[model samples]
Target: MTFEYITGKTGLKEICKRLEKSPYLYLATATTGNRIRLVQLGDDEKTYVIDLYEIHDITPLRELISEKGVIGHNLKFDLHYLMNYQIEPLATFDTMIASFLLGYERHSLNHLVGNLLGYTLDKSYQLSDWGAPVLSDAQLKYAAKDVDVLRELFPKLRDMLNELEGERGEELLKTRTARIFGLKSPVAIVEMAFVKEVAKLERNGLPVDIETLESTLKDIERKTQKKVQEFLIKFRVDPFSPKQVGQLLTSKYKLNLPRTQKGNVSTDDKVLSSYAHVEPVRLLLEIRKLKKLSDKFKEIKENLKGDRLYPEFKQIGAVTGRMSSLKPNVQNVPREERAIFKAPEGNTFVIADFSQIELRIAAEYVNEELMIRAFREGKDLHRYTASLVLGKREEEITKEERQLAKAINFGLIYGISAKGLAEYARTGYGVEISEEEAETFRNRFFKNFKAFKLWHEKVKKELKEKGVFRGRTLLGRRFTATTFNDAVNYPIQGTGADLLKLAVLLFDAEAKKKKLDAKLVNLVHDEIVVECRKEVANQVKEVLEKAMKQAGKIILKKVPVEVESVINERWIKD
Candidate 1:
């Protein structure tokens, strides 16, 4: 806790000089309302607090960070504010991200310090007046303490990370690199750099046709109410009341509807969808869809700042390291709903998606020649799978057969149960397959894809014996799954996540290098959506396809990764 309080040219020079000798410097920034306060800790363990209002020159700090790199807790927040001042660090380490890798759920400095360092750190001044013209002694000490804790945290976390060596350790290390702070992994470094790229995308925001969304919302509300009224007219009860609807369906109509744990009849979507053949039930289902859609439009309207929707994108939102969106949840925006989200007038949307990426990854992991050959041959996998399910050539498989094969292809890769696959067929493809028939289909699928069946059994047996499952994606990111099915699914899904992240990094870097007028705007599941000028749409498509396919080879050597790209005016498929 002993450090020098600094200000003016002398302090800046002394700090800059100190930064030269440090292996990796620790930095922390504080924000009071809208204003920022910064502090840096050198190898000498001395704290340097920079005056936000007085200092005009950031050249020294910026240059030093660019050359020497930086490490800190929740480094993104610091990097974000620093970037505003044109100070982009050349390399970085985020204690928060490392903590996540180490399996620490709560990563606050105080939390990490107290648990890992066994010291109590006060956070009393966190919400204090950081923007004050003259910072209180408490504020300066508090800001300095932030950097001090981070300085202590860096070595401890690094040493702990070092213990996870070999393939296990190397993979963790590589993941750390990919997660964004290492000199060794360029893809990871770029991926980490993408933190800023995503920020720019968020700040740029998605243009919302608010007037249109509002008008559509009103129409939806009216239609929804009318549907509800029709259901009420038929049932002579409150359509919105689940209990009334449940009683009518179960008692009066004698439908074998399911019930919730509380013993009331279940009116959930899946349950309702099962009973959609009934008039009142079908009307209620339509009413529910309308209500949900209306609420989503309302959410977008409410969350919009001016003409754009700024959804917060989380870097490690999923256990598989998939990016997640919130604050109106743009990731799950229905295709129809996306119509309200238009690109800026002159810019067009260039969406590129990896086709059956999960299955491709699974094929590589299972090392199945047949599956790999299908992909390498550029055969329609659904058609090939349909041929396998039915005793026919790929060309003879009908559209309905392809759809069933499509569901089975994805479902089996994820270890979906027969009942689950049946439900999936009913809800997803509208293909009603009885559980007995679903089991037969699943058996047929595994019978044809022999390697997949064996791999599934092997993974389950191994994990079951171990009582836990640990897996590493091709890029060296490690994940642990407790269940057999989850363990089987994790590598495939996590690898897809890793590949997409790398593709984003490469796409952004290549776009910049080529000086192309394109920006990676959003990613949802298997798709990467970029907004670019019309002239560069084709150029961007080639860039995306190259990056995606290249990253695929990096992960899946035997199997080919093919991407489907389309240039459109809105966020929709061709």
Candidate 2:
């Protein structure tokens, strides 16, 4: 990986001069970065370097990447850094994401080189003082080597994924004709563009209501303290002691519960969950839940940078393509506690989300005509499901019956075991149904939801014959699963993530185009939250609704998409 070290105006002039004649080029971003980087041509394998300290205006380099895009390990980390210099790459190809797509266990640059290319990257010097002013050959070698690995790793991993795309061409080609970001693969351009959006949101963290958060923190702690004293005084049970609590539960409640291996009565969640119906156990669980919330809220305070909370969002988080946030996760903020995340006085929080999105994705995927029709006509799927499963008319479904049906409707996505469904319904949402009757309910559910049943059968066949189930979401987000539940879940849940990603990207583009002051703060599975000027809240709301609906149309063409929105000073759900 020997190269020419061009510096100052001479280097910039030479690199820009070669840009016109170079048949192919591979560019790598500088280390953590404010300085030295490298570029190599594919045709002659010629390498050149630039010292940023001397050639401060690397406009040509920026334009080259903006026009030709980049092939790198993790583009998002670089995107955040490059944006500070107003250098936005028009397209991208990330080998890290490509590795995940191809089912590789490790995606690190070092791992990719060692396992795939059969060479170990010497990364020990990465911890060296990159910021220090010095003449260090080892540091430069390590820096040059980062780009050096990509020269082979890109085509090696890129072609590997490129080969996989064609294997499911028919299904994917029909779905994601979006072909955005100017990259070859439909999935590639999408995921690449999504990485940029993720970096932007991370840079612009969520605004919080400091006063409200402080007050709420105090209130939650007070309640937890009160509950702790109640446990010690009234119940005479040690909330922290399983032994004491276990005895009290068995003696007073007289409930035969599961025991630990040592034969003491177990007070674990699974043990107490069966008896969550019991009063004392419920109170103890409630206390534990609140106490945990107190600690979580305390973490949020520590996580705050002034008035904003910047959570770290993992792009390829759970189940291949789903997004997950951590370090005081704002993504899964409890509904009640969300109010503490208030917009500033002059601004408002505009929150919008897809309505029954996963259900709609499944409806379109399996070509469920009845489900599609129900969604089209604005009929309540839960009410209609109750009518079908409970032997009643949709209009005749009581409020209580619809509640029970809601449990059963979502339960269909899991397995069709009568016993499992009954327990799931009870533990999940406290919907009581006996196993004896759940069998009847299960039979009727399968009979009514023929499309889903057949879809499950298709997945089962793939699982049996292929020894695994391979599925692609609407936008070609792909994953392989050995378990039936993962297979059943991939298309529906994974496609929903695709819809949300498209929605977020579109929403950001629309807002930027309109020149609004809106900043995307939080993104849950189905919701997009933005902070914007109160004056333009209505305008941003319209943009959000339009993007979500537009994305829904793009993702699920058969079933009409629905979006709901609310504008408030704080995050809230009605």
Candidate 3:
């Protein structure tokens, strides 16, 4: 591959001039709030410039963008900076978006270069002050390499995509641009962005009622620890170490068991099922006495009310742009755990949530009257649904019927299978419904939402034929999967996630515009969490609801965005 490097005033001018004419915008970006330094390369492999700030040529570049275009990973921040100066690019290409479609998956330019291009783009200079004078040579090479590779990639990607036309090409373009610009597409990094913003919003610890959590932890630990000790004393061996416990259960107690890779018996029930009720097996069965206690033990240690647990959200946790949590996963915990947390003495935990968000978005996307009418009435949605499925009045629908309808509701989001529908129909409602019942339910759903069904079938056919999938919410937020040739639910779920990102961006901007202090703390699949005092919590909830729904309407025109807010850590059914 040919490489280029450009430096000095003459080289810089030439590179800048070339940038104005180039169809793609690629920047080697390492940023620190309101400041971004770019690397420029010339036609020669070893020639490059170390440091050039976009801020210096901000005005002229606006004209450059109007004539040409811009492209990069997370270009929104750059756009944010440009727009701060009241200048917006006419068009843009986001390599990050392209890389996502190509299945590089990671949105970071450095990560993409390493994983996709087979070498790390040195980010060692990432945190270094861009305003620094006498820049390091290492920084120069790293920065310059960005433009070189991007320049090379531009035409290659264009040619690959230019083969398509009509609605398919238009859809693909929407997906790619939306993913990169984060205009209405859900990119995986938004989850991390939400969490990172949480930390930034308030680095100080949240007030926790120490006495409550500590007491519960102590109680839980005592019970679990006691159980662990009891087994240890009974076998005269430690159960904590797998090898020792395996020896005790297998040899000392004479139980038959398969050995794991480390030559230890697996404590898992599936592995021990063959030896059930045997001699040493009794000891294994005795483990049941401690099962609930063990989980409670871990929960206690994690939720020690005295301490603050900071959750780290990953930006690129999934191919779809929904956020994921880690470090201390706030979403991983259950609402039952939060019962232990009383709002710091006199303060109340003002938790709010979006109701049936995806369903609401679907109603707007598919233009289903049943959904819109139900939302308008503020009626019991599940009951209404049960009535629809069973052909009963809402007042006459049973709880069991509601369960069946609820299954149909969520199942349709994933283009439900007869098997999944059957399971939910049987277990969810305590009714022994046949697979035929599920089939009928699915048919009815498709019949009711003919356009949506048509959209699904068309996309599925397109994916099979062309090895790609694309669709946008009623809003312009789009979902795309280049690798989704066989997955039936890929585009649907992807679109749902895309809508979420649009909501996040809208809410994030609204928060800034209104100077609302409500911080986006957590995001599960269909809901978002915000932290705020009870005094203005209702207002925050209103802001979140409006912002979330507004994006969908902006893009898709008139979609129901049932955004709910909650103060609790874990997500639960509404």
Model 1 — which ten-residue stretch has the worst lDDT? 164-173
* lDDT tens digits by residue: candidate 3, 403-430: 7778888666456677777766555555
* Window of ten residues with lowest summed lDDT in model 2: 174-183
Compared to the true structure, candidate 1 yields what TM-score? 0.90
Q: Each model's C-alpha lDDT?
A: 0.74, 0.74, 0.54
- Please, what are the lDDT tens digits per residue for candidate 2 over residues 1-574? 3865656666666666776464334556554355334333221355565556556677876776566556667778777767777777655667787777777788888888998889888868767765566637666666666666777776677566655442122323332212321234545545656777888888888888888888988998899889888878978878888778888888998978775658587887767777777888888889978877878878888999989888888888976578778876865457878888888779989999888887777778888788899999999998988999899888999988888887787778555578888888887767889999888988898887788888888888889998898777766667788989888788778777777777887787788789987888887778889989999999999999998898787677779889999999889966
Model 2 regions more than 4 Å off: 20-25, 30-44, 62-68, 164-184, 250-266, 427-430, 461-467
| Evaluation by TM-score, superior candidate among 1 and 2 | 1
- Residue-level error in angstroms, candidate 3, position 563: 4.0
Q: Candidates sorted by lDDT, descending order?
A: 2, 1, 3
Q: Which has the greatest TM-score?
A: 1
Collision pairs in model 1: 164-169, 165-169, 178-188
lDDT of 1 by residue, 1-574 (tens): 4667666766777778877877667777777555566555555457777776666676777788777567777666676677678777766677776676566778777789998789888978867877767888777778778777877777677666544322211222353343433333332343344565656666667777777788888899988888877777777989788778877887887888765667777777877776778877888777877888888888889999988888877777866778778887876557766878767878888888988888888888887788889899989999998887777998899999899988888887766889999888877887888899888888888887888889878778888698777766665556788887678877777777777887886686678788887766788678988888888888988998897777666666688788899998788785
